[PDB]
Each structure stands twice: as structure tokens, then as C-alpha cells.
Design a protein around this ligand. Structure first.
Ligand SMILES: [Cu+2]
Lengths: 190, 94
């Protein structure tokens, strides 16, 4: 924000970072006066994000949530602040914290394929039938996304959602087998 | 909740206190199955807004009432269905 001993505003900096297309000339956004407009105060300062306050400061994200709630074009005020909360959860995960689930069927719902469930802080190394110990050998921090229910692993062979370990299939020479199926060579029996 | 050594459900207790009009025989409500509908009510009631009120009035009943008010909402904005329960809890705290 310092071009030459001059305190740049975010508008000026953002306009300075412009890179336009050849035939597409773009007009810089017009700085508009404030519209003179606290849901976020309850959740951000509540216990639901408590284990995240100590690592990432919430004032900037509080202001961001206020702006998002005021600037959005539908009166889904409870469901129009999901983006800022998700970003704060992402920053908490990046800060070494362990955010707990804050969504719900009516409050910012997320849809997951098959029988997976949406979670805010779980290991990104999903366990599959081929790699059933992947999560125990993961180096990245926990992330938010769709994960298999505890006690099962993903089916990367039949693509049939999360299945228990005992029902995982096996692959030999490009052909998928079944739990209990056998193959044999000259001197092995598997 | 006791009529003769028995246990009365809240619906039965409410129906027992009816006093109908001379010509308006209002029908008793029909029980409905539960719609199965930590959340916003928990964050609001367990937050720092009500700190000296929790130690005086228990929140659990009013938290449950907040959840019911949210589930039976008529509008889309969830922040508008929690006003009644929060106001009632503030009244009880006073
Ligand atoms: Cu990271």
C-alpha cells in the first residue's frame, strides 16, 4: 500500500493490480459512499468457533461478515453469511486449529455424494479399499469437505460410495475380484 | 400433569382447560408426527449476550423452545424466528 511514501487505499491497490485483455477495455469500479447499514457476532464470538479464536483474529472476518450480510441481494440473512464463515474455518484449518462443525440442514447445508458427510476438519488423505492406511500416513492438516462415515473406507474399485473394510474388493491383473474370491498361479494361491 | 395418579401429556393438559363458546365447538388439535427438523439458537443463548441471566434462569427449556420456533418458521430468514423466545428469556431474566 506504499507506492512512494504514500498510503494506498485498497481501491487504488486493486486497480494497480489490473491486467486487461487486448480487445476488452475495462472501467475501474466507482468508489461508492457507504450505505449506512449483529448475526455474525453470535456465531463468531460463540463457543462454536472458540477453538479457532485463539489462532486467527476475528475482527477482520467480523467486518467481512457484516459487509456480506449487508451487501447481499436476498433476505436469507441466516444463510447469506455462509461464505465468510467458511473462509474463517479455512483460515483456522490453515492456522493449525481444529474447527468443529457449524453447518446444519437449515443453516448453510452442504450436499455430499453417496453416503458421505460434510465435515469441517478431517484429514484430506481419504482411506480407500486400495489404501486403507492413507489417513494414518497423511502430512497435510485437516480440511473441510465430504468424508466417509467412521468405520468405512471409500470404494475406488466399484465406485459405490463408502463401504466397510470387510466388503472391499480386490484387484489382480486389472480384473476386480470379490471378498472371498481366489486366484492361483503355478506356485501361489491367493 | 396428574389427573388420577396418572401422567398427563402437555396436549392432554391443554385440552383439559378448554372453555368453549356457547355455539363455537372448536375442535381439539390433532397430534402431528415429529418433523425431525449446536446451532444458531445455542450460540445465541449460550453466548456472552446472556451471561448474568444463565445463572438465574435455566436455558435448556428456552433453548428447546428456540429450536421449535425455528423449525416452525413461516419465513425464510432464521434471524426473525428467534426474537420471540429470546425476548421471553429476557423477560424471565428480568
Ligand atoms: Cu494450509
Amino acid at each position: 500500500l506504499l507506492s512512494h511514501n504514500t498510503k494506498l487505499t485498497p481501491m487504488e491497490f486493486g486497480n494497480l493490480q489490473k491486467m486487461d485483455d487486448p480487445t476488452d477495455q475495462c472501467q475501474d469500479p466507482v468508489p461508492e459512499p457507504p450505505r449506512n447499514c449483529g448475526i455474525c457476532e453470535e456465531l463468531l464470538h460463540g463457543q462454536l468457533f472458540s477453538g479457532c479464536v485463539a489462532l486467527v483474529d476475528v475482527g477482520s472476518y467480523l467486518e467481512a461478515c457484516r459487509q456480506d450480510l449487508c451487501f447481499c441481494e436476498d433476505t436469507d440473512l441466516l444463510s447469506c453469511v455462509c461464505h465468510t464463515l467458511a473462509e474463517y474455518s479455512r483460515q483456522c484449518t490453515h492456522a493449525g486449529g481444529l474447527p468443529q462443525d457449524w453447518r446444519g440442514p437449515d443453516f448453510c447445508p452442504q450436499k455430499c455424494p453417496n453416503n458421505m458427510q460434510y465435515h469441517e476438519c478431517r484429514s484430506p488423505c481419504a482411506d480407500t479399499c486400495s489404501n486403507q492406511e492413507h489417513s494414518r500416513a497423511c502430512e497435510d492438516h485437516c480440511v473441510a469437505g465430504c468424508f466417509c462415515p467412521e468405520g468405512t473406507v471409500l470404494d475406488d474399485i466399484g465406485q459405490t460410495g463408502c463401504v466397510p473394510v470387510s466388503k472391499c474388493a480386490c484387484v489382480y491383473n486389472g480384473a476386480a475380484y470379490a471378498p472371498g474370491a481366489t486366484y492361483s498361479t503355478d506356485c501361489t494361491n491367493c | 400433569l396428574l389427573s388420577h395418579n396418572t401422567k398427563l401429556t402437555p396436549m392432554e393438559f391443554g385440552n383439559l382447560q378448554k372453555m368453549d363458546d356457547p355455539t363455537d365447538q372448536c375442535q381439539d388439535p390433532v397430534p402431528e408426527p415429529p418433523r425431525n427438523c449446536f446451532g444458531i439458537c445455542e450460540e445465541l443463548l449460550h453466548g456472552q449476550l446472556f451471561s448474568g441471566c444463565v445463572a438465574l434462569v435455566d436455558v435448556g427449556s428456552y433453548l428447546e423452545a428456540c429450536r421449535q420456533d425455528l423449525c416452525f418458521c413461516e419465513d425464510t430468514d432464521l434471524l426473525s424466528c428467534v426474537c420471540h423466545t429470546l425476548a421471553e428469556y429476557s423477560r424471565q431474566c428480568t
